[PDB]
Symmetry: D2
């Protein structure tokens, strides 16, 4: 019965690969009915393929209110409301950083948190039980990440008394298809920053998320959990 998610419906945004995928898979293994999202239909189909009976994939654009609305309705109709929301969808030189780079980061990595969070909150508060977990893996990225943490603390305070927790997981350097493609000199350089002397695995971010999502983390909210091998 320990950290068991039977009966819970989880929505994991941006679940095609790496961290997102590891999270979706672990939540399914712990008993959740899982809905993972991608930006395209084929993306959504690949997610359905790896979840099989434990859930399904859907197409979602987190910068589009209509897409958000349609996806939540479909989830609600087929599975019941979202109990666990994992906001993992996101994207990535100041003297030349352009207006569009800045605002795309704000919309995709920060405002998306606000929108999705607000769209699932009413159902969670009616049930008196809920989990929102933001995964926050460059001045534009930094501002948005810090904003997600500011939002997390502040919102946690408003919704705690209704049984909903709101937290952030902050990965360090994690082994991605992108990290694997770097050369060995670059790999060695990056690891010099990490006292543990290795990259993290996506499954290690998944574990942190699964823990916060469980009944046994009910008194943890407003928290940033760092998973970085000692890097900061």
């Amino acid at each position: 019965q320990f950290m068991n998610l039977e009966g819970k419906v989880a929505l994991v945004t941006g679940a095609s690969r790496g961290i997102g995928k590891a999270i979706a898979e672990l939540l399914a293994e712990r008993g959740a009915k899982v809905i993972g999202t991608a930006t395209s239909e084929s993306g959504a189909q690949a997610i359905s393929d790896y979840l099989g009976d434990n859930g399904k994939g859907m197409a979602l654009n987190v910068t589009n209110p209509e897409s958000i609305e349609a996806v939540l309705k479909a989830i609600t109709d087929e599975f019941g409301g979202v109990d666990i929301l994992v906001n993992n969808a996101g994207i990535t030189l100041l003297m030349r950083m352009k207006e569009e780079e800045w605002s795309d980061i704000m919309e995709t990595n920060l405002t998306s948190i606000f929108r999705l969070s607000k769209a699932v909150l009413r159902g969670m508060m009616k049930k008196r039980q809920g989990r929102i977990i933001n995964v926050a893996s460059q001045a534009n990225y930094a501002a948005a990440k810090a904003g997600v943490i500011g939002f997390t603390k502040s919102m946690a305070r408003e919704v705690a008394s209704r049984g909903v927790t709101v937290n952030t997981v902050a990965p360090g350097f994690i082994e991605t298809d992108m990290t694997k493609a770097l050369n060995d000199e670059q790999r060695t350089a990056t690891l010099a920053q990490v006292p543990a002397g290795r990259l993290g695995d996506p499954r290690e971010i998944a574990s942190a998320v699964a823990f916060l999502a469980s009944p046994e983390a009910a008194y943890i909210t407003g928290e940033t959990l760092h998973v970085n091998g000692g890097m900061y």
Copy 2:
């Protein structure tokens, strides 16, 4: 000592309270000061209190064209901006659960994206001179404390994230980038409360009084001075011990 003679300062949102106190103190320390308001009459009132020590200009920090025009005018008349003080603290209280998306994005544009635009527009000049100061001032906390400013929390934290990150890119060229974070400061709204209400709001503040706008000004003037050249990426809290 903490002398700003020969420096050109732009203080956004200098009509009243904190903004005004800052613009006045920077003028008293020798800076040529340009304060801004959203309207022309606003700009005129600023000109009126600065007299010889500077002038006021109309600026909308959400409008690139307004920004460009204002910086050109400053550059032509005074030379580039040496000190930029961003008022990044124009908000009214509200709960995250109550606020709608338009309130959210207006706060983001006015309080956070404005910092990015203004900062980027003054940086080239500062880096060419190998000397510069950018100081972001967060909003005052009002009657409803931190709970009341949940609407601003993401923006405020973002300004701090931007500050640390950008400080790192520009430090080697003699530009510092810092934030001042006021606590509960005396405003017209707080003056209007009764004494029982003041004490109640003050129960959060160990110092047992509200801060004066001049105290925020001092902190800003210190960071803006030559004697703070090794301070950057920092948030300086001026809050009488709250939290």
Copy 3:
């Protein structure tokens, strides 16, 4: 096989009651062989009584090097080295600074901060030889300048030590409880309870088991990339 502690030996200091006890019980339930401590022999016996075959209790004074040494030798001989150390023993000596006495300061430093240094150093060699270890310090957010100093110190020690030992497979973390239901809170009047809950957005006190869960998670194989971290369990209080 998930968050399973089979084959691991855990030492939980100060396990007589509340948080300490919850931790020792949960670690046993997850498969660890657990040694819990108290300051007296009868304390140690009560701990043996609730662990039964999953471990035993021992008398330990964390301000006494000899006591530390004797306890570790006994653990090592009987069970093998310590794999998991939970530093939970601590005390309070509240008072206004203007009245605070030398002894109230130094007892807090010795019991709540230096003890972490001593116990941590005494288990580290074994853990580094195995390339696997967990050290978890439990620090309550609880006239407290002495307690505050010591707690901030434990956090500084944690971050700094984590950096030295990470590359040898040992993690070092802190769990920071907020207001938790203990014998002390149960004894307060209803007006005082309502006042303390006004500080907590979740609107209830935490359960000792909820601190135990956090500790058990960090102690598990699945938290191998988490180190130098403070995990706050406080219902939103900060």
Copy 4:
């Protein structure tokens, strides 16, 4: 009248050289009557020599209650109570924890942390009587990084925040200044390749000057910082 310290009595512990000295000098230049301390009498005499009329030096061991008491009495008798306390005295005792000795640990605790408790408490009463006071802890320099010290430094910061909350309502502020890599006699004695390597950690691309720590201290000590308390002011050229 700006950041003026005329009429204030300042005690700066550990004022023989570097940061301590720069602080004592600056506070004197801003008008304070300054008492700087060293561990020996000749140390105290050198301090008297550089302060001349603006103050004097005294011998003090911050791990010895009797020494603390004697020094405070002498200050009080001759100058009046301490208005500004700068706790700068500290040491390092480096070592990996798996080899660090009990005495290294406890000497650091006593010298860098408990000393703050003792000196702070000893000046507080006079400060609260006047409804005006400043306590500033300087939590010293990183030196080509120093692991033993981290617990004590973090403790000083915890103590600072917690104490600030108790005494704020009586006009006393309590803050910390946290220097980064500062040019000292020890940094001067590194080779050039080592200096370059350290500076790679610092975005500003140079070491700080002791005077720059002094400025931060003098600001916090002034009337114009009356609403700043419980704060750590970092002076590190962007390092971290």
